[PDB]
Predict the 3D structure of the following.
Amino acid sequence: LSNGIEVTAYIPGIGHNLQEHSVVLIRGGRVKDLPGVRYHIVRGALDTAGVENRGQSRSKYGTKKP
Amino acid sequence: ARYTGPSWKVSRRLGISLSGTGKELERRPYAPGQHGPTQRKKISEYGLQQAEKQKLRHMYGLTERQFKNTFNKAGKLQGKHGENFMILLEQRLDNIVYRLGLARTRRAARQLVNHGHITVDGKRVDIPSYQVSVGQVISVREKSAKNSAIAESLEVSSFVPEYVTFDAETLTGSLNRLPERSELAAEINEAFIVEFYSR
Amino acid sequence: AVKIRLKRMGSKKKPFYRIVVADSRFPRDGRSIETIGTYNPLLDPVEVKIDEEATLKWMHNGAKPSDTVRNLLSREGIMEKFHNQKLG
RNA sequence: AAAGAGAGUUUGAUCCUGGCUCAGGACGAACGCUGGCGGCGUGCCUAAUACAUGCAAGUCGAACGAACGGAAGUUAGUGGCGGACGGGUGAGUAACACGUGGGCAACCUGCCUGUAAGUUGGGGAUAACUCCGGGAAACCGGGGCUAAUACCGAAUGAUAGAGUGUGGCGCAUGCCACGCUCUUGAAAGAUGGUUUCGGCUAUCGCUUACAGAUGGGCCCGCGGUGCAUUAGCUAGUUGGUAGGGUAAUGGCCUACCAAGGCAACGAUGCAUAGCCGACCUGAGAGGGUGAUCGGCCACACUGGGACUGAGACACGGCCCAGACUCCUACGGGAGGCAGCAGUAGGGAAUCUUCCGCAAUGGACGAAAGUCUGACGGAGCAACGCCGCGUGUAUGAAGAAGGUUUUCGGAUCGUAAAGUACUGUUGUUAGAGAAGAACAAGGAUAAGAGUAACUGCUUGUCCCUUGACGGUAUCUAACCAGAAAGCCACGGCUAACUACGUGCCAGCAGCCGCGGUAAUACGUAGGUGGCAAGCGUUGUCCGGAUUUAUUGGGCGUAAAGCGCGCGCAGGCGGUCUUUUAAGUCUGAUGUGAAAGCCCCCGGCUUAACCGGGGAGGGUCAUUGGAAACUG
Ligand SMILES: [Mg+2]
Ligand SMILES: [Mg+2]
Ligand SMILES: [Mg+2]
Ligand SMILES: [Mg+2]
Ligand SMILES: [Mg+2]
Ligand SMILES: [Mg+2]
Ligand SMILES: [Mg+2]
Ligand SMILES: [Mg+2]
Ligand SMILES: [Mg+2]
Ligand SMILES: [Mg+2]
Ligand SMILES: [Mg+2]
Ligand SMILES: [Mg+2]
Ligand SMILES: [Mg+2]
Ligand SMILES: [Mg+2]
Ligand SMILES: [Mg+2]
Ligand SMILES: [Mg+2]
Ligand SMILES: [Mg+2]
Ligand SMILES: [Mg+2]
Ligand SMILES: [Mg+2]
Ligand SMILES: [Mg+2]
Ligand SMILES: [Mg+2]
Ligand SMILES: [Mg+2]
Ligand SMILES: [Mg+2]
Ligand SMILES: [Mg+2]
Ligand SMILES: [Mg+2]
Ligand SMILES: [Mg+2]
Ligand SMILES: [Mg+2]
Ligand SMILES: [Mg+2]
Ligand SMILES: [Mg+2]
Ligand SMILES: [Mg+2]
Ligand SMILES: [Mg+2]
Ligand SMILES: [Mg+2]
Ligand SMILES: [Mg+2]
Ligand SMILES: [Mg+2]
Ligand SMILES: [Mg+2]
Ligand SMILES: [Mg+2]
Ligand SMILES: [Mg+2]
Ligand SMILES: [Mg+2]
Ligand SMILES: [Mg+2]
Ligand SMILES: [Mg+2]
Ligand SMILES: [Mg+2]
Ligand SMILES: [Mg+2]
Ligand SMILES: [Mg+2]
Ligand SMILES: [Mg+2]
Ligand SMILES: [Mg+2]
Ligand SMILES: [Mg+2]
Ligand SMILES: [Mg+2]
Ligand SMILES: [Mg+2]
Ligand SMILES: [Mg+2]
Ligand SMILES: [Mg+2]
Ligand SMILES: [Mg+2]
Ligand SMILES: [Mg+2]
Ligand SMILES: [Mg+2]
Ligand SMILES: [Mg+2]
Ligand SMILES: [Mg+2]
Ligand SMILES: [Mg+2]
Ligand SMILES: [Mg+2]
Ligand SMILES: [Mg+2]
Ligand SMILES: [Mg+2]
Ligand SMILES: [Mg+2]
Ligand SMILES: [Mg+2]
Ligand SMILES: [Mg+2]
Ligand SMILES: [Mg+2]
Ligand SMILES: [Mg+2]
Ligand SMILES: [Mg+2]
Ligand SMILES: [Mg+2]
Ligand SMILES: [Mg+2]
Ligand SMILES: [Mg+2]
Ligand SMILES: [Mg+2]
Ligand SMILES: [Mg+2]
Ligand SMILES: [Mg+2]
Ligand SMILES: [Mg+2]
Ligand SMILES: [Mg+2]
Ligand SMILES: [Mg+2]
Ligand SMILES: [Mg+2]
Ligand SMILES: [Mg+2]
Ligand SMILES: [Mg+2]
Ligand SMILES: [Mg+2]
Ligand SMILES: [Mg+2]
Ligand SMILES: [Mg+2]
Ligand SMILES: [Mg+2]
Ligand SMILES: [Mg+2]
Ligand SMILES: [Mg+2]
Ligand SMILES: [Mg+2]
Ligand SMILES: [Mg+2]
Ligand SMILES: [Mg+2]
Ligand SMILES: [Mg+2]
Ligand SMILES: [Mg+2]
Ligand SMILES: [Mg+2]
Ligand SMILES: [Mg+2]
């Protein structure tokens, strides 16, 4: 993070485009299945792009109107 | 016309025939959708309370936010909260024009008020939510005057409530006095409205 | 030097003034000693309500009306009384 | 008057205890998808980080020595007033800083208002100007000349000082009034009327004294935060005597003398924080916060100091030291946006290098007038609240086409399409407000003052001024035409069917769904909540009686010290008399304005804005009652 803390996030949606050395925006939210994951990566805010071929619930996952 | 959708299913979903009768009965009286004819189900306490709100909101045809605001200031009066709510809503300029017979439906009345076709105390008013007082005169102020739509709706007007006075030569409507709860709707449970907003 | 002056309040392009007594040093809408009356300029016959007793009390202690106030007090007619009580 | 909703989850099933999660409301919010308008407000919460470039504080020729003009009429410097107001920020500060209530017989106060005495007589200069000298530049020296409401003596004048007489007094120190003796302390002219020229006089000023008003200074009772895994702290510290200093009391300071002062009713220390009116939530009691608006405080690159002044230890003043940037001819010089805009950086995150002094209020002036990034307006951003537009009415056992069907049908759907109608909004063209009171200038009238004017005060007429802006607002016509998205549909919780996948992809706040018939994953059709929005995240209150005063408990669920003796503290049998600290009650003063609430009124309604009222205190002075505690 920008304040110098090393955390573990989670990518929602079907398929992504993340690689090492990539800038992303994280937001609150814990995933129950994963032991240590406590944050969610928002999709469509920065280098991370929206999910491909999303028809409904598009405000999440950051996919624009088709 | 804030809600421009089909004004036929809302009567079917609610189960009460808005604007007299015919919207619900005669045709399919059951709810709209794929699973209308079959697949009935029970209603919980939340459903019964919520369904009462929808009748008042869609009968007078106004938005949710106003409904909450006019409910709050209705309960600031002295008396029964539920009864004061319909009395306060009955005061709206849309309803008075509907009651006088100048329009067939509330949607027609709302547009009639909207497009500066009426006047109160000789001053043009374009706010549908204007709250009419007792004794004020409402007219048309010539211009449209002998308009086919307004004249057609004058003939098909059934009856006129006793708390409004109107003669079809000068079109000078007026509120005789503040109305009474018994003579309004009589098919709504105001006790459920007030319980819905207290949760 | 304490002097009586208007105080602007109201909405955008709808001014409404409240006649107050305050020092020249203090802000236009800040500290004041006390309030005397109001002034509506928007009304075509401009209407003003004044105490007619606290003004005369203050003007014998070193209070000076401003440019607009003097017109208000003269039209209402208490500067005549300030004249008469001064010499009498 | 007001007055309180629950649900899921431990088990094969149950009842209790108990935690976790959810349904509501609010942001100076951010992010995602989408996006028509108008009114009213709001917009660097982080780096009190560093700052290009413009503008934010001047004014007076009616206080004193110049350039255009045949010497008429307008424009630098000395001098006065103002720069201590207005505007910004929240670093520090746990204390008389603030809130509330008092005291000052212990204090100061320019301008403003009233009253009383006068505004008399001289002297020596020096800026500007003119030469010389030094230096890159900032700017520094020397010689000569001149004026003032500049500066310094002099006459006269103290309720200023000393020594007293009397009275009337108060709260201990002491106060008020009058009288006597002695000694000190003041000043300025300018602009006009008259006369004569003596002189007089009007206005603005000048000096002293006393009142009022205004603004401040000092002291005190009470009130509002975490840690005892922080127990001692202090030495000008505590008190006294004499002096110094201040507007004023005081260890405020100094010499001497004594050893005191504070603390378990929490000193000291560490950590955090500007305080309040108020804001959000709550049935209430309370819990959290202190952005915008108003009051007080502290700060002005970081430390220290003082000058001038009525007022400063001074945001756009000075001196020294430090860090940083810049100009140097290497000798030396110049700076401070936490002012309005704007730039870089930090950040998930916040606007224009705009128009005016027309209105209000400021500084100067006698007045026009000058200055005012205060303030009025405009610009950008769905950031919030409020209003209403994306069309109305009639119209099929029911158009086509989707989507399903035990293939008959059902649903989208009166929604289409058709006929009839409207112009809020749009486009075009015409009319066009309020906000303006003024000031000054001109005639008068009446007054106080006059030997008389000029002039001063009040009254009535004439004339004059708009950034917004041709803005708001009307009427004339044409167009259904340019204007609907967002989230959910197993339960909590309103709303279900097909196809694809096959413990994979994936979903999720909790219970938990997915392992070739998934109402829970993905897409369709349909539906449900809202709507110019809708969802997610972060923070706070509620539900949470889950710190229980209102309003919980300790046999077995967490929870009675292993037991005693006892200092401090808490509580205490019966009756009578008295007192009045607690208790109850009346009056007076105060608890600002704005905000919540109640009653009216204006914006075409609302939001919003005015007028009146109410509430709000373990508050101060004073008068009562005596049952209860003392
Ligand atoms: Mg989903
Ligand atoms: Mg006017
Ligand atoms: Mg089980
Ligand atoms: Mg429980
Ligand atoms: Mg609630
Ligand atoms: Mg909610
Ligand atoms: Mg748009
Ligand atoms: Mg956009
Ligand atoms: Mg800041
Ligand atoms: Mg600093
Ligand atoms: Mg500069
Ligand atoms: Mg300027
Ligand atoms: Mg001259
Ligand atoms: Mg002068
Ligand atoms: Mg000059
Ligand atoms: Mg200030
Ligand atoms: Mg601070
Ligand atoms: Mg603050
Ligand atoms: Mg005080
Ligand atoms: Mg001389
Ligand atoms: Mg010289
Ligand atoms: Mg000389
Ligand atoms: Mg003398
Ligand atoms: Mg003398
Ligand atoms: Mg003087
Ligand atoms: Mg002050
Ligand atoms: Mg003191
Ligand atoms: Mg204290
Ligand atoms: Mg002493
Ligand atoms: Mg001391
Ligand atoms: Mg301490
Ligand atoms: Mg509660
Ligand atoms: Mg409270
Ligand atoms: Mg701020
Ligand atoms: Mg700085
Ligand atoms: Mg001084
Ligand atoms: Mg300093
Ligand atoms: Mg300064
Ligand atoms: Mg200071
Ligand atoms: Mg200042
Ligand atoms: Mg500055
Ligand atoms: Mg320097
Ligand atoms: Mg700035
Ligand atoms: Mg930036
Ligand atoms: Mg950045
Ligand atoms: Mg101005
Ligand atoms: Mg002015
Ligand atoms: Mg003056
Ligand atoms: Mg200037
Ligand atoms: Mg300007
Ligand atoms: Mg402004
Ligand atoms: Mg907007
Ligand atoms: Mg947005
Ligand atoms: Mg078909
Ligand atoms: Mg078909
Ligand atoms: Mg129009
Ligand atoms: Mg036009
Ligand atoms: Mg026009
Ligand atoms: Mg004026
Ligand atoms: Mg005049
Ligand atoms: Mg005259
Ligand atoms: Mg005369
Ligand atoms: Mg006059
Ligand atoms: Mg025009
Ligand atoms: Mg019109
Ligand atoms: Mg048409
Ligand atoms: Mg259900
Ligand atoms: Mg399947
Ligand atoms: Mg679900
Ligand atoms: Mg699904
Ligand atoms: Mg769908
Ligand atoms: Mg829908
Ligand atoms: Mg709305
Ligand atoms: Mg939102
Ligand atoms: Mg949240
Ligand atoms: Mg509680
Ligand atoms: Mg318990
Ligand atoms: Mg017990
Ligand atoms: Mg056990
Ligand atoms: Mg036990
Ligand atoms: Mg025991
Ligand atoms: Mg004892
Ligand atoms: Mg007893
Ligand atoms: Mg006792
Ligand atoms: Mg108040
Ligand atoms: Mg009204
Ligand atoms: Mg208000
Ligand atoms: Mg009020
Ligand atoms: Mg007794
Ligand atoms: Mg007694």
